[PDB]
Design a protein around this ligand. Structure first.
Ligand SMILES: C=C(C)c1cccc(C(C)(C)NC(=O)Nc2ccc(Cl)c(N[C@H]3O[C@H](CO)[C@@H](O)[C@H]3O)c2)c1
Ligand SMILES: C=C(C)c1cccc(C(C)(C)NC(=O)Nc2ccc(Cl)c(N[C@H]3O[C@H](CO)[C@@H](O)[C@H]3O)c2)c1
Ligand SMILES: C=C(C)c1cccc(C(C)(C)NC(=O)Nc2ccc(Cl)c(N[C@H]3O[C@H](CO)[C@@H](O)[C@H]3O)c2)c1
Ligand SMILES: C=C(C)c1cccc(C(C)(C)NC(=O)Nc2ccc(Cl)c(N[C@H]3O[C@H](CO)[C@@H](O)[C@H]3O)c2)c1
Ligand SMILES: O=c1[nH]cnc2c1ncn2[C@@H]1O[C@H](COP(=O)(O)O)[C@@H](O)[C@H]1O
Ligand SMILES: O=c1[nH]cnc2c1ncn2[C@@H]1O[C@H](COP(=O)(O)O)[C@@H](O)[C@H]1O
Ligand SMILES: O=c1[nH]cnc2c1ncn2[C@@H]1O[C@H](COP(=O)(O)O)[C@@H](O)[C@H]1O
Ligand SMILES: O=c1[nH]cnc2c1ncn2[C@@H]1O[C@H](COP(=O)(O)O)[C@@H](O)[C@H]1O
Ligand SMILES: [K+]
Ligand SMILES: [K+]
Ligand SMILES: [K+]
Ligand SMILES: [K+]
Lengths: 355, 356, 354, 359
């Protein structure tokens, strides 16, 4: 008989229970670790996609206290030129900016397997973290590349992904990564589970990996499938240390894509890295568009705002406390229906709730 | 799993009441109940304390029909006092009117954390019950406000919420509330569960809190998420002593606001007190601004709601509410079993007062 | 600390498992029992509603081997008039006709609680079976009416409902019914579960009652919520001796009423008996609606029985009794129901039984 | 209580867990067994449907490593002439163009043909024509008629490979294997155009079906053909991972150049007819299928290419070097409705249409 290992939950299967609280939303700390050695002032990372992060968006992210990861769908020269543009910028309008020993904004940069020349370049341009991202991080090529980079650059922080199992986490942490990115399938533009049948719902994914990663003191980045600030709060409460976000940031002033107008409204194009457009045979992503939403800064303000309200409901003074206090319930579909807005036509724009 | 999953929580659509042997007719069942340890209603419905649901005009009908309205707090003390008095000075056409020892209509009024000056005035205006409402009742701010008010006015009935766990019900009771409001996120216009990830489906919430509050002899008000008369019946069957309703009352004559037209039909604004527009009188809302259909008079709406409650009780075979809770037994259903429970496979021609 | 008795399934939650078959669908027997003393040659009863059954439809149902029930939304004499027309209607064309000992077609008639004078007039008129219906058959009003009727007319077969629990099934059988009707809230036009919060999904409710009423040898009629022919078969495989149908027959020629056109398509009016229009400070438990016009009753019934026979063929059963002994089910997920319907394919030509 | 045997899962109910992988999608081998004795170089069979497979369609599938099955909705001389067109296509240029072609010992493309119950005179004419495998298909394979026909064919033609379906239970698999079949076709209800679960209430969800028959048919060393319900390449992968040895597909191949029938335009878009064999139009009366249309999707070669590409990717995710390793390594999770909505595309309007994702 076939081997079913578990019944796996995603964000919409669970809610956080309220607990006794002596703290206010504005008082809670959202400091967090990005890797074993790098912290963040806010727990959000903009995704390493050509429709999301480039030098401009990586600057806002650091200024607001998180990070952006320059994508790798460009030649070595260009990624160096984008990284240098983040290191040359600077931030009182930005009190929580995420800077380095020289007071320069932190930035990350993506690489593929066996791309040493690119790591060589990014390291000398001053990259703070290298994000080795694959469609399948639990692979011999990725482990080999991890050990080879930690040999050459022992002081360079390295993030590797994407994985979705305790086994994958143990293997990477043993190869010496400084954080693991978790997510096979969750992303809004991802078709992997449909074209290949592979994937693990993200809440169960994060839960499986944090349990293994913690044995190594290795932070877990929850990558993909965030649709609302609440999904962030669920991701952090299960034990992830930071969240990587793409779709919610691509419709902003700061993302690389150009603005255009279709049938009255303004959009930006958003596409998967594994889609046909971005690979120019058998794609695993789609090409789409998202509505224009304004500045990154305002989108980010609402997401963190919801994280803060969540921590106040749970009663947590900081992220680590959040994770000790968190208790969940599993809901049914009808419970999801009641969690959303029901039986009323929305008539004004809500800044943190659309459908 | 290394994450703490406490239970699997059900809401109104996951369950149905099993019919029982019945010796009673729906017209002969008694629907009186308790709002609080010392205030009784003749029927178990309360108006939400919302600036699109309850004001003096709506609060009067609710009292006249046997229930109670809670005047909302989105106004200055002077105005809210004035709203409270219009109801008290209102005073065979309404034979189930819910009155006080002097024979004035009963009325409620909402308050927030540490608004002690607001309470001083509302007591002097003769309010019967002060509703200490907050997004998160299970907090030091609310506990301390409870103990403070119960120290200053030991005979003023206090309601506090909203909660959704036994631990919370326990805290408020020992702080001395006379009734708890249960409901974190079921509201039609609520986005709490989405914007913050916090919530408990309402049926598991009620059930959990009633069990705890009963130990203290404290009634439970089921707040929000009620879509049809049947939910009012489910909610009471689980242990709630009364139900508070928003969107089903916002489209009426007696709610504040004015009617407006959109593509041939008439509507009324309806919005969360956590919405941008309501709060503006930078913000991270937990509500939305919407409209609902104009549905005529509150009286028509309360008639149908209580009508289906009386129908339910007849099916269960219960003479009064407290018997309805002892006899009631539930069936949990699947999603497809609800497709069958609504109307299905047939196009509706004429509208039904009780069903849209 | 609330009382959740079980998890209740409806038709869409189950499927029949195939079995070894030595039988072909043309050659399986679909006779059954309506009551303790009245048999049917096919297991279908047309519903007792003012938009479904009247004499024109009851005559057809009996000619094809089933039975119609004349609805109670009319004065006594007018109901007497309808039953008499069915009775006096009276071999190669309709070989499977369901007749009484006098060669006349069989007919039922619906009555309400406490309506003894109507019963007398119907017994006088030759009604084979009286169907005493209520929103809540498990009440003192209905039990006392059963006891009274059975006392005055012992040899008159009586049906009572609707009910949805074992305990209710026991009470009706002890009061002397000759059948029970199961169905609280599965009806296509029924809003009971929304208005009162009261119901039991049909497959679980049939299961619970059938077990109980077999102890007395009382057939169970499965009432309401039949959408397709496969639900006919699921209803009987679980234990029901017959099934009652409303929506699938309201859009026929014999259904009482006249057709009307809305947006270039033809329709029949179809309404619940607890709707505002069937009654006229009232609190309805049904809606007023319309169903597409689907032609003759004979064409609809032929497909319905044709899916029952085929189902028997899959399970491998010579008759309904064998069908119930062999039937095994699987429970499916909402996803498994999408796959069991047509998916991914626009349907160009509409099917007769889909 | 009514006898409820289990809770049965369909494809959308499960996902494969990735494992440690040392293989690349392009290096994994996808060869598989069709019957106890006939091999395939790819695991896809085109369905025995009068709008899916005929000689043109059968040829292209053999060229790519798979197999076609010529439908039986035609007279015997018609079916024999179409079986021959495949066998003639190559005798012994197009061997370097289709290097993975599925050939017999004579070098001709392999071909299947469908028969109904008690059609021995059809079988005779098909065997003389050079058919490689005869598939005895029925709405209900677990029946006396199918099993006696299986006995009669294997007695008259001992060395002729025979597939028999459709079944959905271990008991049925046990019966057919014991009657001496060489493969079983699993599938009651899952087909895109089928209405058997709706009209007759009968059927088993396809993942559980495959799982129940594989466990039994393996005891006899007999392969399972997972037949119907495939809407995406990932379904092929799941069906194989559960233990099926090959997959039969109708809907995804009916809108192709090779498919029988002709193109037509309806509101400025091009479609092909695609109907269930139990539909009213297909039976020249209580149907068990409907008559539909499918978007035109160009050549069978490009369709097959994406489908196999998805499978290879799935294999790379699991780390498996061949289909046997895929099955010994595979582990699943069960998912909820919200997990399936997460697994698809969500919140983004698909502007460009992907060659392997259409909703
Ligand atoms: C986020 C997604 C899905 C995405 C992003 C960009 C592109 C892609 C595309 C659409 C190209 N798909 C994959 O590339 N699919 C894939 C599937 C299974 C495996 Cl095993 C592998 N190979 C892994 O094994 C090697 C180590 O040995 C690694 O280099 C890596 O290639 C790849 C997908
Ligand atoms: C009905 C809802 C949801 C609503 C209505 C109007 C406005 C609101 C707003 C949108 C303002 N949201 C909250 O206020 N969210 C909130 C979340 C967590 C916490 Cl812990 C707190 N703080 C609590 O602390 C004090 C006691 O300690 C209480 O006053 C309360 O402030 C507030 C929401
Ligand atoms: C098919 C349905 C649902 C329907 C059809 C037409 C009309 C109705 C109406 C809308 C009238 N609803 C009921 O009548 N609801 C009801 C609910 C609970 C109880 Cl307890 C009772 N009382 C029963 O007790 C007496 C026998 O004991 C009966 O006369 C009856 O009155 C009635 C409903
Ligand atoms: C793929 C489907 C569903 C299909 C394809 C073409 C046509 C059909 C039709 C629409 C004609 N329906 C059936 O034929 N329904 C059926 C149902 C139950 C049983 Cl038991 C049987 N009998 C089977 O057992 C005998 C053993 O020898 C066989 O001859 C065979 O007749 C048939 C359906
Ligand atoms: O095309 C691809 N296929 C599958 N996943 C992708 C692809 N491109 C990016 N991703 C992942 O999807 C994430 C974005 O998910 P989203 O924020 O939910 O839209 C990124 O952080 C990547 O990890
Ligand atoms: O905007 C807000 N955010 C969340 N909940 C709210 C907000 N405003 C009102 N509520 C709650 O929603 C209830 C109304 O629910 P309704 O009956 O579904 O419309 C009120 O009784 C309040 O407890
Ligand atoms: O007005 C009503 N309210 C609730 N149930 C009804 C009403 N009228 C008829 N019914 C039931 O619904 C059944 C028909 O349902 P259908 O076969 O699904 O259309 C009838 O046989 C009655 O048992
Ligand atoms: O008319 C029919 N009724 C039920 N199943 C059918 C019918 N015609 C073909 N099938 C089956 O459905 C399969 C096609 O499924 P598809 O791949 O989802 O379109 C074929 O392989 C047959 O086994
Ligand atoms: K809500
Ligand atoms: K219904
Ligand atoms: K189907
Ligand atoms: K996805």
């Amino acid at each position: 008989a076939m081997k079913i290992v578990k019944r796996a939950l995603t964000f919409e299967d669970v809610l956080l229970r309220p607990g006794y609280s002596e703290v206010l939303p504005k008082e809670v700390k959202i400091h967090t670790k990005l890797t074993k050695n790098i912290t963040l002032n806010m727990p959000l990372i903009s995704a390493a996609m050509d429709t999301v992060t480039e030098h401009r968006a990586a600057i806002m992210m650091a200024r607001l206290g998180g990070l952006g990861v320059i994508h790798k769908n460009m030649d070595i020269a260009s990624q160096v030129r984008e990284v240098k543009r983040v290191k040359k910028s600077e931030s009182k309008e930005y009190p929580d900016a995420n800077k380095d020993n020289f007071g320069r904004l932190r930035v990350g940069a993506a690489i593929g397997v066996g791309q040493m020349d690119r790591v060589d370049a990014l390291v000398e341009a001053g990259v703070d973290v290298v994000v080795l991202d694959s469609a399948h991080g639990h692979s011999k090529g990725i482990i080999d590349t991890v050990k080879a980079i930690k040999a050459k650059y022992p002081n360079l922080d390295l993030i590797a992904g994407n994985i979705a199992t305790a086994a994958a986490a143990k293997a990477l942490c043993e190869a010496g990564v400084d954080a693991v990115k978790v997510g096979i399938g969750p992303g809004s533009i991802c078709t992997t589970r449909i074209v290949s049948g592979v994937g693990v719902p993200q809440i169960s994914a994060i839960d499986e990996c944090v349990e293994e990663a913690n044995k190594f003191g290795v932070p877990v980045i929850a990558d993909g499938g965030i649709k609302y600030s609440g999904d962030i709060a669920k991701a952090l409460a299960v034990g992830a240390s930071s969240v990587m976000i793409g779709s919610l940031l691509a419709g902003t002033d700061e993302s690389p894509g150009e603005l255009f107008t279709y049938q009255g409204r303004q959009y930006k194009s958003y596409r998967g890295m594994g889609s046909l457009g971005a690979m120019q045979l058998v794609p695993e992503g789609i090409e789409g568009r998202v509505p224009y939403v304004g500045s990154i800064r305002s989108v980010v303000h609402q997401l963190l705002g919801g994280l803060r309200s969540s921590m106040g409901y749970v009663g947590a003074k900081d992220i680590e406390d959040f994770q000790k206090r968190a208790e969940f319930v599993e809901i049914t579909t009808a419970g999801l229906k009641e969690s959303h807005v029901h039986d009323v036509t929305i008539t004004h724009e809500a800044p943190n709730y659309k459908v």
